[PDB]
Amino acid sequence: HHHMGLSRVRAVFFDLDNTLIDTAGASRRGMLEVIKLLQSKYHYKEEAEIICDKVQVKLSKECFHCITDVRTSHWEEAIQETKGGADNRKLAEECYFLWKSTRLQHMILADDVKAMLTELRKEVRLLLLTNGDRQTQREKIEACACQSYFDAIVIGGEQKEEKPAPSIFYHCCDLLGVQPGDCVMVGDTLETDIQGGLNAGLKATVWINKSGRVPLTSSPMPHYMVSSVLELPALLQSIDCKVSMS
Numbered sequence: 001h002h003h004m005g006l007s008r009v010r011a012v013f014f015d016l017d018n019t020l021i022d023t024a025g026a027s028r029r030g031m032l033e034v035i036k037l038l039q040s041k042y043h044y045k046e047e048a049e050i051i052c053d054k055v056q057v058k059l060s061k062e063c064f065h066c067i068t069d070v071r072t073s074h075w076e077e078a079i080q081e082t083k084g085g086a087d088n089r090k091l092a093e094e095c096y097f098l099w100k101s102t103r104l105q106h107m108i109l110a111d112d113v114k115a116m117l118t119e120l121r122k123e124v125r126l127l128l129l130t131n132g133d134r135q136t137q138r139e140k141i142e143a144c145a146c147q148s149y150f151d152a153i154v155i156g157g158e159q160k161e162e163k164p165a166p167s168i169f170y171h172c173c174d175l176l177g178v179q180p181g182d183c184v185m186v187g188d189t190l191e192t193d194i195q196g197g198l199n200a201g202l203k204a205t206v207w208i209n210k211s212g213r214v215p216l217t218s219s220p221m222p223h224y225m226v227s228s229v230l231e232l233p234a235l236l237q238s239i240d241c242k243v244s245m246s
């Protein structure tokens with residue numbers, strides 16, 4: 001009956017945010033543009049940063065479920081908490097849409113990532129697996145124009161559950177006509193991407209960790225850790241050489 005053999009990767013699932021695009025940095029540039037607006041146009045002082053930081057936290061505390069309203073309100077609340085006064089929706093909308101336009105303008109696929117994705121697609125299925133609200137993620141995808149690189153795109157806000165729930169990963173596999181055991185997840189977040197891949201029994205999880213710092217407490221343990229998605233082909237190539245029982 002049984003024998004040694006190889007088992008090639010058939011599909012790679014990629015995060016979008018902070019994996020393929022610099023969401024973190026694009027977002028800092030947005031906040032810098034809002035600070036510039038508030039300081040020059042509205043003569044804010046160090047309050048400008050306080051407000052932006054407040055909104056960063058508020059953003060980070062959103063729950064998975066009308067995003068423009070929600071996000072404009074973050075701004076409204078943050079301005080009111082800092083500056084007092086009645087609600088200022090027009091200033092909040094100015095800030096919000098400036099943060100939003102700026103960050104989207106700065107979301108781009110690097111040329112070397114384009115070339116890597118193009119090359120990889122010859123050999124494996126590529127799927128974009130991205131958590132977040134449908135509108136927001138779609139706007140990101142359109143801004144960095146990455147749709148043409150992927151066999152499929154799955155957005156968590158369009159599904160019953162998102163990462164790390166294993167169901168979304170099984171949906172990805174079904175879309176591609178592959179098994180979880182054939183798929184590699186690549187992403188920069190332990191609690192969603194990595195745990196999610198572990199939950200779903202994926203062939204491997206690859207943690208993108210630019211800094212290289214590892215946590216000190218219990219956490220999901222990825223199979224691999226790399227600085228950049230550009231290190232992925234070698235890993236895949238090496239996975240494709242691993243011997244296991246038939």
Ligand SMILES: [Cl-]
Pocket residue numbers: 136
């Ligand atoms: Cl976001």
Ligand code: NA
Pocket residue numbers: 015016017018019187188189
């Ligand atoms: Na991410």
